Amino acid sequence: GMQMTKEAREIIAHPKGTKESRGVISLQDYIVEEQAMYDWLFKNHPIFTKYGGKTVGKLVVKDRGEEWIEEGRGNDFSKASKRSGGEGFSSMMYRVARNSTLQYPNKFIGPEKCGECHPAQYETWSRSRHATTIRFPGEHPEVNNKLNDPVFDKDTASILPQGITPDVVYCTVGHIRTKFGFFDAWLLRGTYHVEGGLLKNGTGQIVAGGNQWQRTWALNLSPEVAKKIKKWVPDFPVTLEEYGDNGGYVRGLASYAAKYKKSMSFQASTSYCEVCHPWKFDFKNESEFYAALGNAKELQKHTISKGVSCEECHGAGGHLEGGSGLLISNCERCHQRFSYSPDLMRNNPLNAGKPDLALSSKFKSMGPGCGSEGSQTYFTAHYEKGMRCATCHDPHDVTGNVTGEKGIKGVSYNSEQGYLSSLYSKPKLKKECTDCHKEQAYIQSKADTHSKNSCASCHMPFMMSCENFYAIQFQDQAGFDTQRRAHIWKIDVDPARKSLVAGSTSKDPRDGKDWHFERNEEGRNFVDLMWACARTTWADKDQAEAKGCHSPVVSELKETLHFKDQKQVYNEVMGWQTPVKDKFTQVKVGIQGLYSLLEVKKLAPSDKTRVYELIEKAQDTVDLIEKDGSWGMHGFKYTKQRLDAAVEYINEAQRIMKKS
Amino acid sequence: MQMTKEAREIIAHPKGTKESRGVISLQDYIVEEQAMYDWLFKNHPIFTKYGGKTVGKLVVKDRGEEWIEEGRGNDFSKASKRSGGEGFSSMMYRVARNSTLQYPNKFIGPEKCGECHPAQYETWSRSRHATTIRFPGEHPEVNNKLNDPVFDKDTASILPQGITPDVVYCTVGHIRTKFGFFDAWLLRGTYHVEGGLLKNGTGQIVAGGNQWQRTWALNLSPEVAKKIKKWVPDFPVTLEEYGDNGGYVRGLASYAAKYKKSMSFQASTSYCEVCHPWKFDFKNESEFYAALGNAKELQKHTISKGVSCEECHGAGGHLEGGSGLLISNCERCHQRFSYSPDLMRNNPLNAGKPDLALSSKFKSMGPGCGSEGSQTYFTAHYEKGMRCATCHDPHDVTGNVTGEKGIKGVSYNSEQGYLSSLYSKPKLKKECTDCHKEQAYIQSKADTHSKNSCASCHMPFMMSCENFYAIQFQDQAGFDTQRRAHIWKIDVDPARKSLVAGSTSKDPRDGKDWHFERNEEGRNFVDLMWACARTTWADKDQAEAKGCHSPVVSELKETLHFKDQKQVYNEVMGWQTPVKDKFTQVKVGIQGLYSLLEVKKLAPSDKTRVYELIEKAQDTVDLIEKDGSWGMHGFKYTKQRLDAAVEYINEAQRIMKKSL
Amino acid sequence: GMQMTKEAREIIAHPKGTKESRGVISLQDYIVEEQAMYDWLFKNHPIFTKYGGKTVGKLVVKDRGEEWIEEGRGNDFSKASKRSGGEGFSSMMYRVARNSTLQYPNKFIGPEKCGECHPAQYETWSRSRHATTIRFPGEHPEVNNKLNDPVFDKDTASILPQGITPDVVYCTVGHIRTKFGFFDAWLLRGTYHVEGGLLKNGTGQIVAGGNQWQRTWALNLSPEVAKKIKKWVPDFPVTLEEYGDNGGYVRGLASYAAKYKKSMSFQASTSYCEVCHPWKFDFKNESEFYAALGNAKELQKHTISKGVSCEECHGAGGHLEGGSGLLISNCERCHQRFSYSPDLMRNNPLNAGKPDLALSSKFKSMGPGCGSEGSQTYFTAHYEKGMRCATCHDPHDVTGNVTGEKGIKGVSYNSEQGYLSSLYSKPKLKKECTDCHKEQAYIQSKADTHSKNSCASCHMPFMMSCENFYAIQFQDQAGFDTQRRAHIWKIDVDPARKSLVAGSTSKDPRDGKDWHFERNEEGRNFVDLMWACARTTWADKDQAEAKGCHSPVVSELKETLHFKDQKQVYNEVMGWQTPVKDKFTQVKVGIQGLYSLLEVKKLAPSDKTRVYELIEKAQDTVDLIEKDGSWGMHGFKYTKQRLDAAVEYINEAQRIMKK
Ligand code: HEM
Ligand SMILES: O=S([O-])[O-]
Ligand SMILES: O=S([O-])[O-]
Ligand SMILES: O=S([O-])[O-]
Ligand SMILES: [Cu+2]
Ligand SMILES: [Cu+2]
């Protein structure tokens, strides 16, 4: 029936933490501390006290033992390592650095207190999604504070699912940007709704799923857009019923950590959400905490920090006397999301004994997860060269000056609330690509086909699934659950090889088993050309402003520029790169031949001068093209024409040489 | 006699965090200061010996005004959503760790850090950070004569009349700019004693006459002042013309006081301990209060003076029993943010973003010393991730500067290294030329300003350390000019000014709400009068380059004495207009010729030759565009490159001309 | 009477620490706290309890008083400083940042617990020599776990010297890479062996020295190689006896902190080793610690951190609740090793009052010591520009993918334990020379004599001594005790000036007194041509794959490329640089004159265009060669191809200007 997971039960039965032995809290101490919470929930959550433990769909407990220990094949990683004799535990993706929300008292003073002395950082931080990821009812002006009304069209979803009303919700998680979710007053993750009644008075039935409000489904993927995609992808779901387990009762409210009417996780905020979308309460001790649980108002009134606040990155009380000590976040708590791939291990016998080298990112079904930018960057040249998040990003102003969409006429949507209203993100950067890649920027600056595209538009497609909307993941088509920006940069040019592949445990192309990034010959992640050129998304401002790129679904270009498969994209690339690489090689061979001749042939001074001059001008051209390294993809006309001139330089020198 | 209204309101309704959370925050510091002021009202000699009677009124200035109200913090607070607009904002003056009111502390002193880090002790100890706080007997640069004239026999001593070393806890400062003193009661020295000696309670307490100023004592003689008056007719020459700002002898001005009219009554705790600190070894507060009033006792129990290792790195650093290691970002002492209602109002894009209307603390009409951080905050360097530590060594902040052997003063001694110096030469990790290669390359060619440093134009000494408003005539780029601006961007305009009065100003001399202007990119900028024609005696580059174009200090011919910004602007236009005109024709030429290369009627070899010439010309355009000074970095070289490109374009046109 | 050092006792008699006065432990507190340990050892170590205090060779106590205070002339530095009126102390090279191994309880949880949440960094750190510098018997698969049999040839050394058996060894220190040492079960540094019996039985005699297993002596420096070296360096030692006090009873076991049969340091791990090759125990208090001492098994059982583990760099407990506070190591605890040189101060009157500017590195006799990369880099352009270890190095994967020497057979050596078996190091870097030095890299990329060398091959010779094997230090010949890589970069071009020189106090070229680095006119350390080009070493994989470079000992090149002195190297450099500089000057002067002429001669527009084209293309060449700054040493053939073109350009423009 109802119990903690195996992993947790095994650690509880034989704990090897350090709190008692060393006076220092470590991973296993966090697994054990969670037991009272689950015991309290099995006795006091309405699902047991009012609904008799009955649900439409099976309840499935998912505590820190599964999230912090088992996730990302941490047991396989552990067995593959020498650490603790191959007998230890590995927390691949979900863990905290400091005390959890089960420890009272804590030393948090709240971001407003940091802001008294650091008013400048408070301002830029406070207009970011870090600051408002956790909010209370009354803090949603972007839907005029109507959490139970349709956001967009009147037949699509509200933020809160039916039967969940604001007075039984501790908080929402998320934004209009991508998705929302909710926590009830007992700090249980909202993996359910209530049909035929309300949670608030124990009426109706608890139903699994239909729990996660999804912007793209609600706004952009109408039945007519779905039917357009279905012309290309004959399995694409159109009717609500074709979304199946991933769906629900109304377009816009999908099932997440649940399958609709079939199963639902039963999970406290402590097991998972506190890692990345946190809050902290001001209670003196845990009794005060347990007495306030189940009362949304009392919990809210005692909330001293919401979301990714100053102290979540910099430590409770920062550097203040009596505080816990200053930290400077490297972001890996919430943005790394390592996941071990036995396939990457098996496929490269050179990696033997180095299970770190077979790390991938957490996948949500067939797409790399949101909050995986760190595990993605780990296998890039950038990271090898010492670059980290803070190299490029401002850590405070992470959302930027984005705004609402005035053209949307929805039932509750209000476009005028700044970033709260926005469908996009524009993080403030310390470094642009053009700061370090000057030759690429130079070629790209010459007026041509993509000369208005940002560097990011080809190099950082929106490959990541935040929603685990597997009903719409058709990855070989570079769509359609595409809400976060890949941090990989390297573009592979190949007719067939894919960035994203199924694990060897997969038995159907759509089962979603053990999907992972593939690695190229340099041991790095890469972006395939279907993602780079032809991806489909509604999260990409650059793409929206460049005619939807080459997506058969969102491109506004003529239809002969709609790219349907990677081989077609590859052949377009080849049409540009092959003549460029031919002229390049011709020049290189010409330069070498002429330097050989100059070592033995004697020429009149004015002719010697000219021959040398042409060789060196040809060399300037080939050095520039070689350093650029795109073989015409950063600007074909400038590139081809410059090389043509250089071939002609070589031809002139050869005539002069032949003459003498 | 009472604490300020601001401090009293917080005392009446405190909302700090020391009791509620075990963590000391801003409001706790306001509250803790009460006992000190109660003690000073009963025990300070002004009251116990002079009966409360002063020539000039006493105006209490505690943390309530310094750490809360300054920089228009209450206006910033009301403009913020933080705490519903009802909070407090510490804009410029606050500490990060315990104040000097908490005993015991964990400070061990810099000599102990020095035992294991002898290398950093050596570089730090020969810096002004190390000696900004000194005790009588530590002033070899004036032969330890604190009561005799430093320079000429008719100019000031460091300590004003009535103030003797034995009633002084310390001096603050150096010969570099200015000195001040604290009395043995740790009250700031905003007064002197006429017809008597403080130590005897004889004579009368007189407001002002309290801050020794190097520039007034040494450089600004009535002869120099008369020379200035010739250009600037309201410039003061006689001592009485210096008015409230002055005093009874040249070289002792009034600061935090107006001569015979008003004087601040302020403990060290309210203000100075933020930036020119000290720490005592007392085991508790009773020992501290028992020593107060005894200079020798305080001195003996002083464990840290000035900006010592632990002031940046934390009491005890990383040592066991220490308070935890810090790495200073310098904003404690070098930021000095100040909110400008005008910057908010003037730019409706800034609405709801009061951080964007931040300026720097002004000392009347000039940006204050220690505002390098609030200046750099609104620069491209800062946007690109650059911070103090990007360019500066944090230890060797003074450099190898020395005294002036040519000065013959009553007490000045020129042989004490940096103590004797008029200048500063901070050690740098990065020079402008390390990152700005095109600019450095053009600037390296022998020409008019090729021997100037980059910093000589880009970083003028715009900042007032002394608040010597008697001599501030900002439209003329003088004359209270002691610290170096960290702005870099130079605006090229006939009239627009860096520094402007606030809209509360009713007279050009009243100095109300002065602030920096912002350009179209939202950045601070340096006007041409500052960049080219400023008058200062703190700038060694300017002293070694014939005084630049200051009508007051220039040793150049008189037509190179620039008297207003329009004149400077016309000189800049004499260079940039022909450059920009030629550049423009070359660029249009290149584009036109490139487009005409698709005309038949052109021999192939003519076609290639045309290309070869416009290609070379494009190199010139690219260098000039990148440089971006339009000849200000080296007119002769810029002209040599453009003359070449003019020939290339005329030769290509000559060849094109045959087609017709 | 066995007692602590003069230096320790003087501080103990007049202590000026901060632990009692301020609640904060500082340097003098660490000196004071070492008393009980030495008193315990004088009473309880087998040297006294089983061998009656008798040893072949004099016992010389060396505690924190000498190591943490007197070393590197800290007393001279102190007297040259204004700090504490010239009357303070200065810890030049050996000191800790946080509690020593004398303080109990501590807050260490061990690297496996860090790695539970940081599995990635655990993996890379765990395959590095930081992780395994401290090991217990049982953990040496690279010798088939035979610490008492010969490693390599049957007539060379085992890791543990005779009389010393695994059961009375707490740990080894080191690797096959360079050398090993041991600590006995009482945590005394192994500066001795036992002849005629076993330490564990109290039989035999304690003999001084012959205590440090040395890879290069054991493997590479056979009597035939030594004879080859002797042909060039006549005083070079060939027979065991010619190694003298530095030597011992078997090739491969040298004397270190000891002179064979003559003297031996008596030193607890606390005095020196715990700075840089540390461990930590889990004991609740110092009683459990002392009760365990002398029992290797119980000490091992209670060892919670070994070697340079996560917490040694990051702090006990890291950032965890109840831990001691996160640190980010800047490496200077173990890799700096500053040493004050009164010669550098005296030779430069400008440095007066500034003793920091006369800092050098720890020397082990006549070679800069291992673990002095920091004091070296401190006087480099790179450091002046803000570069630190972490600019170039990954701090975790510091060993790299190096492997055993397959092809050598030895009685015990096992070549398939990966980095454990390896003779070399390949630290993972964040930045390569070529990332910042583009012009140099471009010229070096052109196929030519050295175009296949790494940048580091010439710029970072293996100048440093790990072993203090002074019997084989002949520094004017750039050999032969050469185990770690110099971090200096700047190459000086001179027929005679040397990087490494003897102090003023030296009275014999081989007495090894006060050796230091010389400083050039820019105030920096520099690499002389002998070290850069013709050095001899067995630690440099780049050199072994490039035919041994120009070493007369290891070079496989023709004998005319065996460089025997610096004057010869210099003459080879001048043969490249002189023609380059001559053409460069010709071009540069010609550009200048052409631009002047253009100001006052008139030409046909079409001629004028030509003169400009030729001058600008010559300028491009001048700017590249000048920025490169090697005057052909980065690629003579290409450098000459560019300058040959630019001489033509200028000649042709002068031709045109003549009419
Ligand atoms: C791409 C690899 C290398 C880089 C990045 C590099 C870098 C440098 C740099 C920055 C300098 C300073 C130049 C100056 O003073 O302006 C230099 C000088 C020098 N390098 Fe290299 N180097 C490389 C490879 C080599 C190799 C393989 C050798 C020897 C075969 C070598 C020998 C020298 C010498 C002898 C100098 C001194 C030149 C002089 O001052 O006269 N370098 N190198
Ligand atoms: O549930 S969060 O990973 O999108
Ligand atoms: O009083 S200080 O800001 O020059
Ligand atoms: O004994 S360690 O300095 O190679
Ligand atoms: Cu997500
Ligand atoms: Cu000042």
From C615's Cα to the closest Cα of chain A, the distance in A is 11
| Secondary structure (3-state) at A192 | strand
Q: For residues B157 and B163, what is the distance between their CA atoms, to the nearest angstrom?
A: 11
A113 with B17: Cβ contact below 8 A: yes
Task: Please give the method by which this entry was determined.
Answer: X-ray
Residue A347: C-alpha distances to residues A48, B295, C400 (Å) = 48, 77, 22
Give the mutation candidate from C304, C321, C403 for the A interface (greatest A CB count, under 10 A): C321
Chain A residues near residue C115 by CB distance under 8 angstroms:
83, 88, 90
- Cβ pair B260, B56 in contact under 8 A: yes
- Cβ pair B368, B362 in contact under 8 A: yes
Q: For residues C476 and C463, what is the distance between their CA atoms, to the nearest angstrom?
A: 11
Q: What is the DSSP string of A528-550?
A: -HHHHHH---SS-HHHHHTTTTT
Q: For residues A432 and B102, what is the distance between their CA atoms, to the nearest angstrom?
A: 47
Q: Which residue of C lies nearest to A353 if distances are taken between CA atoms?
A: C123
C135 and C62 assigned to the same domain: yes
**CA A107 to chain CA centroid, nearest Å:** 31
Count other C-beta atoms under 10 Å from residue A400's C-beta: 17
A525 and A570 assigned to the same domain: no
- Cβ pair B304, B283 in contact under 8 A: no
Burial of C241 from C-beta contacts in 10 A (0-12 / 13-18 / 19+): exposed
Of the residues A546, A562, A578, the one at which a domain ends: A562
| Residue keyed to tokens 């000194």 | B134
B352 and B292 assigned to the same domain: yes
Q: For residues A218 and A228, what is the distance between their CA atoms, to the nearest angstrom?
A: 17
C652 with A606: Cβ contact below 8 A: yes
Amino acid identity at A67: E
- Cβ pair B429, B392 in contact under 8 A: yes
Contacts of C105 (CB under 8 A, 6+ apart): A22, A23, C283, C284, C285
Q: What is the CA radius of gyration of chain B?
A: 28
List B205's β-bridge partners, or say none. B54, B193
From C590's Cα to the closest Cα of chain B, the distance in A is 16
User: Phi, psi at residue A65, to the nearest 5°?
Assistant: -60, -40
Query: Is A171 known as a binding-site position?
Result: no
Ligand 1 atom 22: the closest Cα is on which residue?
C455
For chain A, the distance separating the N- and C-terminal CA atoms, rounded to the nearest angstrom, is 96
Contacts of C596 (CB under 8 A, 6+ apart): none
Query: Is A562 known as a binding-site position?
Result: no
Q: What is the largest CA-CA distance in chain A?
A: 103
Domain count within chain C: 2
Of the residues C531, C547, C562, the one at which a domain ends: C562
Contacts of A116 (CB under 8 A, 6+ apart): B25, B26, B27, B87, B88, B89, B90
Burial of A349 from C-beta contacts in 10 A (0-12 / 13-18 / 19+): exposed
Amino acid identity at C415: S
Q: For residues B556 and A656, what is the distance between their CA atoms, to the nearest angstrom?
A: 57
- Cβ pair C134, C171 in contact under 8 A: yes
Give ligand 4 pocket residues (Cβ under 6 A).
C 369-371, 466
Alpha helices, DSSP H, located in A272-372: 273-276, 286-292, 296-301, 310-314, 332-335, 342-346
Q: Which residue of B lies nearest to A124 if distances are taken between CA atoms?
A: B355
| Residue keyed to tokens 């410029």 | B92
Q: How many CA atoms does the CB half-sphere of B26 hold within 13 Å? A: 27
Query: Tokens representing A480?
Result: 């359609």
**Signed CA dihedral, C162, C165, C171, C176: sign only:** positive
- Cβ pair B69, B38 in contact under 8 A: no
Q: Determine if residue C96 is left, alpha or beta; phi over 0 gives left, psi from -120 to 50 gives alpha, anything else beta.
A: beta
A514 and A404 assigned to the same domain: yes
- Cβ pair B546, B554 in contact under 8 A: yes
From C96's Cα to the closest Cα of chain B, the distance in A is 9
A159 sits in which H/E element: none
Instruction: Give the dihedral of Cα atoms A461, A467, A468, A471; nearest 10 deg.
Output: -90
Contact with chain C for residue B599, Cβ under 8 A? no
Of C172, C174, C191, the residue nearest C45 (C-alpha):
C191
Contact with chain C for residue B137, Cβ under 8 A? no
B38 and B132 assigned to the same domain: yes
Chain C residues near residue A28 by CB distance under 8 angstroms:
116
Q: Domain limits at C611?
A: 563-659
Give me the sheet containing A169-174, strands edge to edge.
Answer: A134-135, A169-174, A179-184, A212-214, A253-254
Contact with chain A for residue C282, Cβ under 8 A? yes
For strands B191-194 and B204-207, give the pairing: antiparallel
For strands A359-361 and A338-340, give the pairing: antiparallel
For strands B57-60 and B262-265, give the pairing: parallel
Q: For residues A389 and A395, what is the distance between their CA atoms, to the nearest angstrom?
A: 8
- Cβ pair B512, B504 in contact under 8 A: yes
Q: For residues C540 and C548, what is the distance between their CA atoms, to the nearest angstrom?
A: 9
Residue B143: C-alpha distances to residues B139, B175, B411, C86 (Å) = 6, 13, 6, 22
Axis-axis angle for helices C605-628, C438-445 (nearest 10): 100
Of A329, A359, A331, A334, the residue nearest A344 (C-alpha):
A359
Of the residues B561, B586, B605, the one at which a domain ends: B561
For chain B, the distance separating the N- and C-terminal CA atoms, rounded to the nearest angstrom, is 95
For chain C, the distance separating the N- and C-terminal CA atoms, rounded to the nearest angstrom, is 97
For strands A263-266 and A58-61, give the pairing: parallel
B556 and B568 assigned to the same domain: no
C384 with B429: Cβ contact below 8 A: yes
Q: For residues B432 and B457, what is the distance between their CA atoms, to the nearest angstrom?
A: 12
Q: Which of residues 370-389 of A touch C (CB under 8 A)?
A: 378, 384-386
C488 and C573 assigned to the same domain: no
C7 and C121 assigned to the same domain: yes
A113 with B81: Cβ contact below 8 A: no
Q: What is the CA radius of gyration of chain A?
A: 28
Contacts of B460 (CB under 8 A, 6+ apart): B477, B481, B484, B485, B526, B530, B531, B534, B536, B539
- Cβ pair C50, B76 in contact under 8 A: no
- Cβ pair C494, C520 in contact under 8 A: no
C464 and C567 assigned to the same domain: no
Contacts of C7 (CB under 8 A, 6+ apart): C65, C66, C69, C70
Resolution (A): 2.1
Q: For residues C256 and B517, what is the distance between their CA atoms, to the nearest angstrom?
A: 69
Per-state percent for chain A, helix, strand, coil, to nearest 5: 45, 10, 45
Whether the upstream peptide bond of residue C480 has omega within 30° of 0, thus cis, is yes
Query: Tokens representing B45?
Result: 């000699």
B360 sits in which H/E element: strand B358-360
Query: Tokens representing C643?
Result: 């300058």
To test the pocket of ligand 3, the residue of B210, B212, B374, B465 to mutate (highest count of ligand atoms within 8 Å of its CB) is: B465
User: Phi, psi at residue A419, to the nearest 5°?
Assistant: -65, -25
Residue A72: C-alpha distances to residues A90, A352, A470, A504 (Å) = 9, 19, 18, 16
Of B221, B149, B135, the residue nearest B184 (C-alpha):
B135
Contact with chain C for residue A18, Cβ under 8 A? yes
Residue A112: C-alpha distances to residues A123, B82, B627, C658 (Å) = 10, 6, 44, 78
- Cβ pair A218, A210 in contact under 8 A: no
Q: For residues A101 and C310, what is the distance between their CA atoms, to the nearest angstrom?
A: 27
| Residue keyed to tokens 């009126």 | C85
Cβ of C639 closer than 6 Å to ligand 1, yes or no, is no
B582 and B553 assigned to the same domain: no
Contacts of B291 (CB under 8 A, 6+ apart): B280, B282, B297, B298, B301
A554 and A582 assigned to the same domain: no
Q: What is the largest CA-CA distance in chain C?
A: 103
Query: Is A175 known as a binding-site position?
Result: no
Axis-axis angle for helices B565-596, B635-656 (nearest 10): 30
Contacts of A620 (CB under 8 A, 6+ apart): none
Per-state percent for chain C, helix, strand, coil, to nearest 5: 40, 10, 45
Q: How many CA atoms does the CB half-sphere of C423 hold within 13 Å? A: 24
- Cβ pair A292, A253 in contact under 8 A: no
- Give the Cα-Cα-Cα angle A503, A505, A511 (nearest 5 degrees): 80
- Give the Cα-Cα-Cα angle A579, A582, A583 (nearest 5 degrees): 90
Burial of A201 from C-beta contacts in 10 A (0-12 / 13-18 / 19+): exposed
C572 and C558 assigned to the same domain: no
A119 with B384: Cβ contact below 8 A: no
Of A371, A360, A364, A361, the residue nearest A470 (C-alpha):
A364
Q: What is the DSSP letter of A209?
A: S
User: Phi, psi at residue C205, to the nearest 5°?
Assistant: -125, 140
Amino acid identity at C380: T
| Residues B319-342 as b or e (16 or more Cβ within 10 Å = b) | bbbbbbbbebebbbbbbbbbbbbb
User: Phi, psi at residue C98, to the nearest 5°?
Assistant: -140, -170
A616 with C617: Cβ contact below 8 A: yes
- Cβ pair A583, A648 in contact under 8 A: no
User: Phi, psi at residue B141, to the nearest 5°?
Assistant: -70, -10
Cβ of C441 closer than 6 Å to ligand 1, yes or no, is yes
| Secondary structure (3-state) at C58 | strand
Q: Which residue of C lies nearest to B105 if distances are taken between CA atoms?
A: C22
Per-state percent for chain B, helix, strand, coil, to nearest 5: 40, 10, 45
- Between chain B and chain C, the number of residue pairs with CB atoms below 8 A apart is 116
**CA B169 to chain CA centroid, nearest Å:** 26
**E strands along C479-577, which residues?**
500-501, 516-517
Ligand 1 atom 38: the closest Cα is on which residue?
C630
- Give the Cα-Cα-Cα angle A481, A483, A485 (nearest 5 degrees): 125
Residues in chain B, total: 660
Q: How many CA atoms does the CB half-sphere of C5 hold within 13 Å? A: 23
Chain A residues near residue B23 by CB distance under 8 angstroms:
107, 109, 316-317, 320-323
Q: Determine if residue C320 is left, alpha or beta; phi over 0 gives left, psi from -120 to 50 gives alpha, anything else beta.
A: beta
